[PDB]
Design an enzyme around this catalytic site. Sequence first.
Site, PDB file in Angstrom:
ATOM      1  N   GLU C 155       5.692   2.913  -0.197  1.00  0.00           N
ATOM      2  CA  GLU C 155       5.733   1.704  -1.016  1.00  0.00           C
ATOM      3  C   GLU C 155       6.288   2.094  -2.380  1.00  0.00           C
ATOM      4  O   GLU C 155       5.530   2.435  -3.291  1.00  0.00           O
ATOM      5  CB  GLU C 155       4.343   1.074  -1.122  1.00  0.00           C
ATOM      6  CG  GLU C 155       4.322  -0.304  -1.756  1.00  0.00           C
ATOM      7  CD  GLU C 155       4.644  -1.410  -0.773  1.00  0.00           C
ATOM      8  OE1 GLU C 155       4.572  -1.163   0.448  1.00  0.00           O
ATOM      9  OE2 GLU C 155       4.967  -2.530  -1.223  1.00  0.00           O
ATOM     10  N   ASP C 156       7.612   2.046  -2.510  1.00  0.00           N
ATOM     11  CA  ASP C 156       8.314   2.416  -3.739  1.00  0.00           C
ATOM     12  C   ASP C 156       7.926   3.825  -4.190  1.00  0.00           C
ATOM     13  O   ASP C 156       7.425   4.049  -5.293  1.00  0.00           O
ATOM     14  CB  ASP C 156       8.062   1.388  -4.844  1.00  0.00           C
ATOM     15  CG  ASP C 156       8.767   0.072  -4.584  1.00  0.00           C
ATOM     16  OD1 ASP C 156       9.824   0.086  -3.918  1.00  0.00           O
ATOM     17  OD2 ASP C 156       8.266  -0.974  -5.045  1.00  0.00           O
ATOM     18  N   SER C 157       8.166   4.779  -3.295  1.00  0.00           N
ATOM     19  CA  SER C 157       8.004   6.195  -3.588  1.00  0.00           C
ATOM     20  C   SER C 157       9.087   6.958  -2.842  1.00  0.00           C
ATOM     21  O   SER C 157       9.706   6.440  -1.909  1.00  0.00           O
ATOM     22  CB  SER C 157       6.609   6.708  -3.204  1.00  0.00           C
ATOM     23  OG  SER C 157       6.377   6.568  -1.815  1.00  0.00           O
TER      24      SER C 157
END
Lengths: 67, 115, 196, 46, 49, 49, 258, 34, 51, 147, 528
Positions: C155-157
């Site tokens: 998740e957005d990493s």
Amino acid sequence: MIIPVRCFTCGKIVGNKWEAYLGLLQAEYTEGDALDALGLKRYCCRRMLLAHVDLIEKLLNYAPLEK
Amino acid sequence: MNAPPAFESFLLFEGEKKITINKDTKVPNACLFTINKEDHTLGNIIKSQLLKDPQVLFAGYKVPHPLEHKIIIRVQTTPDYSPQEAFTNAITDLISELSLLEERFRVAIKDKQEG
Amino acid sequence: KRHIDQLKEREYNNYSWQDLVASGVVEYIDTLEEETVMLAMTPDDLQEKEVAYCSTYTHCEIHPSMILGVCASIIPFPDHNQSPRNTYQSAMGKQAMGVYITNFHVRMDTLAHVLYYPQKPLVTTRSMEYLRFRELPAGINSIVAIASYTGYNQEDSVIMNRSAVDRGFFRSVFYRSYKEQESKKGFDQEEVFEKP
Amino acid sequence: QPMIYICGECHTENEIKSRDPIRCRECGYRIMYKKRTKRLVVFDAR
Amino acid sequence: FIGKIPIMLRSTYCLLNGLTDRDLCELNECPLDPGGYFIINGSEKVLIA
Amino acid sequence: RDGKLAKPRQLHNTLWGMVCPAETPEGHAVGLVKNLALMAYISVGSQPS
Amino acid sequence: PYANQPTVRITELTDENVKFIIENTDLAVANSIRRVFIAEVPIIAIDWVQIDANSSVLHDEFIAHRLGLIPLTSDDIVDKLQYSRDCTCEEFCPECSVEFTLDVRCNEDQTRHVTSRDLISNSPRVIPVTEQDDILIVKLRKGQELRLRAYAKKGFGKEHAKWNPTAGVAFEYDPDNALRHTVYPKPEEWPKSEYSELDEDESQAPYDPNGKPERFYYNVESCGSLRPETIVLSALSGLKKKLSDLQTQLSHEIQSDV
Amino acid sequence: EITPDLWQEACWIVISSYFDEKGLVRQQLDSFDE
Amino acid sequence: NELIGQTVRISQGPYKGYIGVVKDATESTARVELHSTCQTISVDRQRLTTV
Amino acid sequence: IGDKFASRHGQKGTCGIQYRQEDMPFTCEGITPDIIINPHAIPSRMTIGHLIECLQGKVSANKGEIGDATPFNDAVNVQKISNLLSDYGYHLRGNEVLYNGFTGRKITSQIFIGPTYYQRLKHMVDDKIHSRARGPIQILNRQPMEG
Amino acid sequence: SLKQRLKGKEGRVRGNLMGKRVDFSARTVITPDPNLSIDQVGVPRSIAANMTFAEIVTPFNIDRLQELVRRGNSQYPGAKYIIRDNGDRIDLRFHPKPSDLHLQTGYKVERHMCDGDIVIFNRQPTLHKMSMMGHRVRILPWSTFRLNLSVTTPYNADFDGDEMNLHLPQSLETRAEIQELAMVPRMIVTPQSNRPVMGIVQDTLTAVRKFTKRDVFLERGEVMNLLMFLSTWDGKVPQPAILKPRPLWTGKQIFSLIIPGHINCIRTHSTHPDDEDSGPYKHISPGDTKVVVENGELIMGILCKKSLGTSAGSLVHISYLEMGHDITRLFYSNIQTVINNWLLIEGHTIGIGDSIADSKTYQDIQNTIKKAKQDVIEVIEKAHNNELEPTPGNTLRQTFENQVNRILNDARDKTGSSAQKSLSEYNNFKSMVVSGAKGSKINISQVIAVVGQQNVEGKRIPFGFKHRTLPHFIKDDYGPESRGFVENSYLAGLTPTEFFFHAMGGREGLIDTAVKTAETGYIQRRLI
RNA sequence: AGAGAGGGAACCCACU
Ligand SMILES: [Mg+2]
Ligand SMILES: [Zn+2]
Ligand SMILES: [Zn+2]
């Protein structure tokens, strides 16, 4: 600033190619021809010289503080 | 700050066993082999070799966490055949084939460098 | 074409932008005057005869890429993105680590973020040549792969390469300055630098 | 006992004293730069 | 003497106006700096329009 | 700041070419704080005489 | 119930790379050998940098980092060196380290390039690899200098990337995916591999369910720290040593249980 | 004459001339100058 | 203690060869502020050798 | 991990984990990714320019020239980029068969790979990490400090 | 003044009595981790070596606590405070003499928190009770809060620089209270809409949607690798779905091993045809789009977000109600681990090849745009000649505006439908949309076919200039391109006028997002 | 082996 010693992805020794890269550039070669004249097949090794900015030459204009 | 030192990948410490054998209780003839300070570069080959035995009913390995350096190799063998025997035979088979491969690579080097 | 010929040979003919303004070729149009001007977007499309749109153009835009700001000009293909993404990149672009100034070794700046091996972008715009983004860059060209994996780019990493980082990949250096002076006062409290 | 400072623009070195106004002897430049420490430094090449 | 008024860098009344890049590097000032900011108590200030 | 209206914050049509349409602080200052476009230039003004 | 017999066929051998084919072995064995190429091969790299003096525009830790990634000729010494942490010496000795000394001051108006040549070793065998030009460490203006003593120690790729002897290890099996491990949506658009043997009319090989991964193609390009063939020899020896030590601990644990 | 299709490289010449003549901060410097 | 604020050199163990400054010291162990890494680690006094 | 990186398209994100080179996937050649980003960050945010930058990056790094990415060009569309990439022995749309770094079995899907330009933001995790336990206390009221 | 000191949001009543600074709390960035349970948070060592739990010395733990005191502080297992029977604190960070380091039954030892300790994990906008839940401490090396994936949805934390607050219950009584009340297994089903809040997050959802397909077959080695990650596996390898030619397990068998106990649910896949249950094949689905879990085993169907997501009546909700809550925690952990480990073999990506349609689709899109554009133009020429008649209820200009918006919306819908008929079942945009993990059909239409009409305040782009939107358009131009309709897609790129109008729409969205927060928060505060 | 910490207010930029 100064040219990295190794390609980040491969580890190919690219730090010894920068001055020869400039020499091939000033000898009227294209950048790709200069790159594979230095022997850089993988594009990750090609971006190390193709997209490098030699900023240490800007850093050397200033007089050294310690002397 | 909280960066683990680079030698945490392969160096053990006092009070750490390299290999720990825990007999599984869910099914007969099954054991969990907890290898400390290793990674897939051992367990993958061990699992592949244990799949070549006709007497191993289950051969798997997993890392509990990539930040903690340990693997667990679960071996279930056919009854009358101990899983520890399968493990110690897989290690010997791997050593044998790797030594043979190294000798053949030496022969190939001698062929190539001398025409 | 003669203007371009005299403009390519700068530092020789001393033919500057102000000479072209004096030549009656370009002129400055403000917001009031834009309400009463017929503006051509590009000359290759809006001056050739077709099923005519207006055929009464007064001015022509130099280049549409000049409608953007300084931080929106470093975005490659900004028109292919979504506008909120362009705005967020404009916010992030003033935050990327890099060589913020050439004389950073002299400056006693607080919170100086500089980078080991900054690189110019392989995919660049023509406008970066005028912001001098290729001389004081901020960021490194990286071989990215858009792949689902073990589950740490969830998740957005992003999953990074340890060996590359060990080779100086994005390894920055953070400078922080501390200033202090003593105060000569009415003899009741007197600061002085000494080893206590 | 005296501390050696590098005289900024002058790039020369001079002694300093406690409670001594910070001035160079060449041109009176106000900015001094402290010399690098004499104790050893060791860096892991990582 | 009326008083002192601040000067933003790279003006027509700043010291480094029209100086060559070599002269700027001699003054420990980079030619890359666009100026346009005041130095007040050592702090660089920008007058937002 | 902290106004519930939107007209002073929106991207008006006359922001074309003079001010960047994308760059803005996306916090509670959307549209209020803007960044000038590249070729845009503020007229310094002269005498009307 | 036993290990298959692998075989090696080397297509070329150059001072940079080695290209060979390993047939009749499992996929995990092949992948591990590649991983041991990258990580478990020990070489000699600088790890202990003491900066006596420094006046260059680049700071101390930047110079120490650049000294770390310099490859060193360790073709035969790395097998003789003990690991530094394992040695019984007084925390450094010629049996687990190689001493390097750099002493450069620029006394001319030209920009003096402190290259890898200025690294002076006491061991004649362990020297920087650099026909090709030297590796640029730091440029110097007149009046600047740097003096340092650097100790290089034995280590492998898991510890740090400066102990990585391989520039690039290309590894691929089944170049025409008869196993169909990868599923192309439109195989016509896909370029053929270097080891493909299909005519240009055909895109990919027909599927066989009874097949297994074999005939693995390797392209091991060294960075210069080791010859490309001694990387493979050291890798096989290291992997065998790891398995042997695992077996020894296994024997101890089994004897403990009984 | 005119620039029929080399306009793509001709417009950026005038952009370079503008930013070499003016610069990025002409607003601040000219305003304080005046 | 006496070892406090004394430049030490780890002469034994995984951290061998590191130069640091002792922050805290005990009868058994002592915390060493490593000059290289951004980390302070504790080692035995038998593994430390002063400069 | 925890350090905040970002693309040139608003595609920010912290570092989830750092694998070594042998664990990172690799192509038919020895090229491993430096960054592996989430495929799910694309479809809802709709940063197709990130994909086009990656494709032009492959073309630029292979051709040996710094690519041009002006917004309104009409001389560079994705089809021309794909046709230029096809000449250098790659797939039309930048997809490349990645081999798994752990098992070695080649990945069934064909992973989109190539060079982009990533920016490291000022925000680390060491600057933001802090814990507290009965430390300094305010004087106005006996409550813990701020910051 | 005193009244000014009390009246504010920074005063005594709100700022000091209601919300006050608290000891024993940590704040650092979160990064994802799928290898730990949903009720486990991976805290750093330097945080755990600074936050202490006061453990009472009892004869059961007197030796363990004695050893921890012997280690002292900064020897991580150790402690820092030892409290006497009369409330006297003795430091362990300052190394006292070994004489007063004894322990008898009654002493307190404030020891550094270890694995298994309970902490409260919360984000800032605690709009509901699942934004502040209790986790179990796991000590991981790096300096971030490693928490699981499925806990993102209740927290609304997307790891892009998010930092969370971690409170430590000091008393044993409150530790048991948090364990019995605020555990994330006990906060799976929310009371606001009687549905789960955890669900299955994007990447696991897409990988499990591709996993449970009918054409997924697994080799014996891959099956054993997957079964190694099942925590609730009884050690019995299931009988393969294919025995004689190449023993090949179907992924549904492995997922049946995942599904706990014996639960029975019937769900429908996101792409289940509505005319399938009318005629034949209502029980033998040709598309495998009818999810049937029966007697704890997945009979058939592909599990999209309507099967494993946060929707009511899903598989996870029934697993929570029919089975326990610890079992559901195991269910979440098993799904994440094994599906991710199969995703390693499978692999999932997205690229520029997933955003390009064939030339026939592009020709269809351009033909539709041209037809709609000509239709708008002829509607305009009808409006100019007063041949347009007003709809009863509004003006003539709005009959025109309704006609233009209706035509352009029809063009957008038709182009979107014609674009989303050409994914060829391998397009990763369709892979994420069908599973419902991330995106929708509108994103596919805008990327491939056409962005669509840009709006400001619910209508088209207004005439900011004198009777024209931009200085490039002629005055009184009510056409599609002049008024903000964008016929290009994100794949082709936008023209500068379309780019500016698209920026206007994005600006309106950002303004809505930035202004909504304060009003919503004040409404929440008044309601509470 | 000698053991605690204090400022406070104001205003800017970002961060999710
Ligand atoms: Mg966030
Ligand atoms: Zn002087
Ligand atoms: Zn030794």
